[PDB]
Symmetry: D2
């Protein structure tokens, strides 16, 4: 039988990653409140998550990685996000960066993983840095904001534009060691506080050529790492869909948790003004139902999309323009549905739910943040899909 | 690769029912306009559909039926509804009634199908009839409204309440021959006109006991026909989810067609007042995108739900309270999503689209009708699900 | 003097107001509604009744026997009227508001129309689809001019066309032509507002002399031939278009207010077909009735406020600045969209019976949606117009 | 000319209260950030607001009060809420309580205002207290949560149920001096932080009969203070619509501020990923337009409702069942519209807007809180109005 309201535990003889997550979930849940005040992921959480081996989800097998399918991974992040969104958000990023790093040169991957098999990277991908072309690579300078999980990473993946005979942008990623940049703690946010999305400061950072890859090359199987793992079901695929798969995952985790949290707290609810046992009133029942349907629909779309990713990777098939536009955008629609489902419950949660001692308030804030990421912006995504559906050339104004 | 915007054609040797539908679809599409003025399904349409054998979708194999899975069937209805909603709606009903008839006695099924293998039933299920208990069965009297496809059926499935010693209702279905009732043509509607949902008039109609089955018995595998087909993947299951699977299917077909129809007509769209070509303006693009996502999400939910039905039928497993509530209600949420997707396009279609010579106007009206059926009413469904999710007893006020 | 949230407040001017006069004839209009829909135009009886109370002279100058009604008072008459028959109200509103434009043309044209026949009106077709040849003394116009609501009952038509510049910039212009100059082609087969008789006008080598041509911009800015004619008027010193197009939203509000009443009437006794439970007062239905009531009351409040703003401007002979003009242009479109939401919310809970030809709900639903299909009520366009103005951007010539 | 986007400044000789608010508004705006960390209204804010005399809005003239009309008052609160919602919310309550106090006995009013003309009350109205009937009054015990502005008030209006020969509830209000209760600082909320809605602790508090009034009596012009001020345009009216007029007022102020704040911050907005200057893109323009229309409509409804209040008060006319239901509920619809308007802008504000250093984030949170008050709950209000519109008896489960 299928499950509409959450992830189905894969019945494979042994313990699946999802079951392993499920066991440590209560611990993650209890750190949530102190995680929020810490403004970064508690060490205990990283320890637990690394212990079960989730960070090796998309690490090549040759280094001791698992090469988990996208669906299985995403479902781990969804479940995790229910306990602490920020932990799930940051840890998802640390995980999915490994998938990108697998498309860089064998030389870089050896450098990261032979040395330390448990090493991970955080990122700052918006190309704000100033790049001087020196020989053997580049010198990069700039303030690189929003690096989720940066405190727990050994490296950072940093985005920049190089240029051209013609002066056209070459969007590129460099991988730099923790020693090359300062973490500037300016992370004071109103949602997903525990993600520790601090800024990375780069001062005359040299990046050699072998630690630089073109974004387009990693979208199209033309990067230095292409072909390294010919038995892999996950590396013959564009980097970005995996890169950014976690946001919507987190959004779904939060929304599914919201429905549970709301149900728990509603049962016993009494009207301040009249003194009525009011938890099972029709309006509240109908809200619970609709939000349940809305996120179930969101889940079905995501599950279908993830399946589409999986099938493509299996066949080493790169997506065509149309499926790529769907992969790029479906997650944003999912995020928008989830936020609707959360808001519908929050609107009926009452004043008590806005107190610091109510989990609902945290879920609400975290849910909204998931739709604030540049990748989950639906105005942008509606335009990207719309243009593709009408056979128009892409608008370079957005990506 | 997966398809977000429509049904995936099943990869089989020879040709699948969906491919057979796809071949005759242009013919069905061209009759659509005269079908709407006919206020019933054109003979040609029934002929074509019976020729490919779709009416034998849920007929037992022993009578030459196909015993199609629910997903495969539902997808045929979706595709069909794109060409002529009314035809798909009525024909879906004729089909799914066979699934119920398979749960009646072997004696009744032999009576219907050994005589005529291509025989079907229309229905009128709301228990408005007055029932006198005679011996050997009942005498039924009353006006039985809304019998979609009644003109093309050899029988009718008719709903009525019998009474229990105490005085509680026994909701029952009787199967009566075309000769026992008069079709009263009062079908003048504003949507799904081609379904020919005329009224059936019953005057002192005797129904013998073997042609009567309890609704609850056919929900729970306790009817006279239970066990007849021990190799069947579709008969060991409640009757009602199949019975009413077509409405949402039709709703999805319409909405997917709406997106295509709107896209076609938008390209060349010119502003009356200013004279600009305006078909690719951002607002329209974003609408096309959003409605595409909305119905894709609607499809994903339906596909998942249909899969759930299929798996249950395979294992001869009757659903528990929870899954049953989801099966009962997911379709209603799907219908609601589709209508939103249609409305979003219609709101931007302009006055032209409201002319009799525009298909959009037909799709809009037909779409809205799909949410007007008592089974797709979402207020009712929100309550049914909500109550179940909170572990409340069902409200007998609705079903 | 308590306020009314759910409909128009009847003005207590001593004696009888136009709204009361509408209210008296409303049951008659309501009963013709069904045959009006099959007629695909306004029944003669309806025009007769409405002209008898004198509503068509709402915006006719007083010198010709006109009333010069304020915009609020007029709009409210159309709202009330739309409850009984949307198509009648839609078409008749247009016949009325055209007189307001005609008052900005030359004294010569107005004399020509109204001294001859004081009860004469114009229908219109304003989208500039015609081909114009500049002859001397005027123009020769050719083309098929679609969608002329109430064209069967009009003595004239107001017809839109582009003339051209030294540099070939468009000069959007309106010509007023007599019924004898054009053929009404009956291609009006629509799925909403059927009774408006929005047939097409066919123009074959129609000569329009200069004095029967006015620039749109001139009538927006108080620079047309008729400017200054009526110095005591509280309604003619104002842009033509806001009055021109005031009726669409009015009709949309009338429909939505009627929908709430119609739904309430039909809901009380509603039984579940399946269970036989007396279900008219169930919480979901009650909450829908409430929300749609609030939504259209909000829509009304916006419209009433906007109409008041129009009235005050006209009183002071003050032309609106860019900002208020953008609000006047667009508020009605938001009102229309709210009303359609309010209707849809009720229709979604109305059940299958409400989609039968013998149910008024179905007519209200269709007519409601049509009101949001007019090029002037398109909200995507309006959102852009307002948005651009709010951010201090130049207007987008792609829309208007 | 009318104003759609804010309050019209009344043209009078001298300076209107709204102009006086407008002059001090920049000061209130600058304290907003430290007000939020203070978790109560800064002394400077109370000082400024009391200096202009706003607290005397609804104080009877005989004590030096202004007896402002509801519209004029409400508009001051709307404007004020734009600078600091919590300040406006708490100060509105201090103001509107005076209006209730005007319906108590002359004896109580003399006691409060002859002594201190600038004295105000905060409140806690939900009847959670345990009441012992002693002679001469009652002894009240209990924890009385959520008293906005309690730190700045000289008194508290406290709600409780007494009983009746037949055991019916008699909902009553008592006015108690600051010395009779302890302010327990448990106010740690996620919105409207600066309102200082701490809890009042009542231990064996004696309330004499003359400081107790029946709620129903103050709804119906039957309380001890009725008739005291026969020239008053505001006191011959139910207490509650004034009592609770400020919530929606605050909600509107926040939403109008949001539009301005969003406009300011959008102009210069660049896409992180593409470097495009993107502040004037169509989707953002359309959002600004729609949110502008939505709150304008919300304003129009409120202004109309306030007008209706004013007219009634002038004529000393108590509202009938129907208008009362509208007065009770319109404000809840207004709040719901405003929250939609804010959410639509927040959804397009991007990640930067969720940082602690962005005002948008404060406006969002504050907006949502305004719809969390028991009085602004729309599910409750939809039910109240719906029942009245259908001529049903009120549901005692809600009020
Ligand atoms: C920001 C905020 C401030 C409030 N201030 C007061 C107050 O000053 N006096 C009062 O009686 N209630 C106040 N209320 C509480 C409400 O009156 C009501 O008791 C509360 O919303 C209980 O509803 P709930 O617990 O179901 O959410 C306030 C509520 C919130 C949202
Ligand atoms: C019910 C209906 C009646 C109309 N009546 C008129 C009319 O009388 N005169 C006119 O110029 N336009 C009329 N219009 C047409 C619009 O002005 C406009 O030209 C039309 O909406 C073109 O928009 P479209 O192409 O997008 O649909 C009417 C439109 C509809 C919805
Ligand atoms: C287009 C249309 C076709 C229908 N066809 C049938 C039918 O074939 N058999 C049946 O029992 N009910 C049919 N129904 C009626 C419903 O089962 C149900 O009795 C009806 O929706 C009553 O709900 P209402 O009167 O409250 O709207 C149909 C309804 C509509 C919308
Ligand atoms: C909670 C949160 C965490 C983020 N973490 C990262 C990150 O780890 N790496 C990164 O490149 N961008 C991260 N982003 C920033 C986005 O990629 C993007 O640069 C940002 O949304 C800029 O959009 P805006 O300023 O227009 O809102 C994060 C954004 C948010 C909402
Ligand atoms: O690739 C993107 O545009 C979204 C993204 C941003 C940061 C990140 O770490 C992964 C994906
Ligand atoms: O079973 C139901 O309640 C819905 C339904 C109605 C008619 C029909 O033919 C099939 C299903
Ligand atoms: O002026 C407009 O653009 C709208 C309009 C169209 C036809 C009409 O008769 C009046 C106004
Ligand atoms: O009267 C109410 O029910 C709402 C309200 C609550 C507290 C308050 O201070 C004023 C009004």
């Amino acid at each position: 039988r299928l499950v509409y309201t959450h992830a189905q535990t894969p019945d494979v003889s042994g313990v699946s990653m999802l079951e392993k997550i499920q066991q440590i979930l209560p611990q993650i849940a209890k750190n949530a409140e102190s995680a929020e005040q810490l403004r970064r992921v508690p060490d205990e959480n990283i320890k637990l998550l690394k212990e079960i081996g989730l960070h090796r989800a998309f690490q090549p097998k040759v280094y001791g990685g698992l090469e988990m399918s996208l669906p299985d991974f995403a479902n781990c992040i969804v479940t995790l996000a229910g306990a602490c969104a920020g932990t799930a958000w940051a840890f998802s990023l640390l995980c999915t960066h490994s998938h990108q790093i697998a498309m860089f040169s064998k030389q870089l991957q050896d450098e990261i993983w032979l040395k330390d098999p448990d090493a991970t990277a955080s990122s700052s991908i918006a190309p704000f840095g100033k790049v001087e072309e020196v020989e053997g690579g580049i010198i990069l300078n700039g303030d690189y904001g929003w690096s989720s999980g940066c405190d727990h990473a050994e490296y950072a993946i940093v985005g920049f534009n190089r240029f051209d005979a013609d002066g056209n942008k070459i969007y590129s990623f460099g991988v730099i060691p923790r020693s090359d940049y300062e973490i500037v703690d300016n992370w004071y946010a109103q949602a997903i506080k525990s993600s520790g999305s601090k800024m990375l400061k780069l001062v005359n950072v040299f990046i050699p050529e072998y630690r630089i890859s073109k974004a387009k090359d990693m979208m199209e199987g033309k990067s230095a790492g292409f072909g390294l793992y010919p038995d892999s079901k996950i590396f013959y695929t564009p980097y970005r869909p995996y890169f950014a798969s976690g946001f919507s995952a987190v959004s779904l985790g939060i929304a599914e948790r919201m429905i549970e949290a709301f149900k728990e707290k509603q049962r016993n609810r009494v009207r301040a003004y009249t003194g009525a046992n009011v938890g099972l009133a029709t309006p509240a029942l109908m809200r619970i139902a609709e939000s349940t349907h809305q996120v179930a629909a969101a889940r079905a779309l995501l599950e279908k999309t993830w399946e589409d990713h999986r099938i493509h990777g299996l066949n080493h098939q790169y997506p065509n323009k149309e499926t790529l536009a769907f992969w790029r955008t479906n997650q944003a629609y999912a995020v928008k549905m989830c936020i609707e489902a959360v808001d519908r419950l929050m609107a009926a949660a009452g004043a008590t739910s806005f107190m610091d001692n109510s989990e609902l308030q945290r879920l609400f804030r975290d849910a909204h943040m998931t739709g604030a990421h540049a990748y989950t912006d639906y105005d942008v995504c509606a335009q990207i899909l719309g243009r593709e559906l009408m056979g128009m050339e892409p608008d370079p104004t957005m990506v």
